């Protein structure tokens, strides 16, 4: 049994809710929240900008030190950093950004990072300002992630379309 409440069950392991991932993280304090990161861990906008704002920029300060030591992530890659006030850990995952022309096949590699964690609160990778079709992102999630994933979707319109169209 876990703390997550109000989710619709899509599969054995994937759950979805119309929610504010920031507000959901603040309530649950999950072991892992996933960030929709870029390779530079520059948390300017989208989910990353919202998560970072909720940490009062501490996520960005930590991320800048990580990049100064390790250099950029790979598209499809990830790193584990602090969850600050939101979670124990933040798994920063880089999905392909279609608005940069990145290979959408890298979306499966991105989701494979989730399998290193038993339970996660996450957004749909490559959705929103990363330009991918969120319906496609949810299909790749269900077909790739084997651990227990709680997906948060703020836009009620998109949430309803994802549920109604789910095979
Ligand atoms: N992707 S997100 O969680 O940052 C998000 C999306 C919308 Cl449409 C509104 C808010 Cl307040 C937050």
Contacts of 33 (CB under 8 A, 6+ apart): 21, 25, 51, 83, 86, 87, 89, 90, 91, 120, 121, 122
Ligand 1 pocket, mutate which of 50, 156, 159 (most atoms under 8 A from CB): 50
Pocket of ligand 1 (CB under 6 A): 20-21, 46-47, 50, 128, 154-155
Structure-determination technique: X-ray
Contacts of 31 (CB under 8 A, 6+ apart): 87, 88, 89, 117, 118, 119, 120
- Give Cα separations from 61 to 4, 40, 83, 91, 93 (angstroms): 29, 12, 13, 16, 17
**Counting atoms of ligand 1 from 1, which one is nearest the CA of 22?**
3
């Amino acid at each position: 049994v876990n703390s997550f409440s109000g989710y619709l069950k899509l599969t054995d392991n994937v759950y979805i809710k119309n929610a504010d991932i920031v507000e959901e993280a603040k309530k649950v304090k999950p072991t892992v929240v996933v960030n929709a990161a870029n390779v530079y861990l520059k948390h300017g906008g989208g989910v990353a900008g919202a998560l970072n704002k909720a940490t009062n920029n501490a996520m960005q300060v930590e991320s800048d030190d990580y990049i100064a030591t390790n250099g950029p992530l790979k598209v499809g890659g990830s790193c584990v950093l602090s969850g600050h006030n939101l979670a124990k850990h933040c798994l920063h995952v880089v999905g392909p950004n279609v608005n940069k022309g990145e290979d959408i096949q890298l979306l499966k590699s991105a989701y494979e990072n989730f399998n290193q964690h038993e339970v996660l609160l996450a957004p749909l990778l490559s959705a929103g300002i990363f330009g991918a079709d969120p319906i496609h992102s949810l299909r790749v999630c269900v077909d790739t992630v084997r651990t227990n994933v709680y997906l948060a979707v703020f836009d009620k319109n998109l949430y309803d379309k994802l549920v109604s169209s789910f095979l």
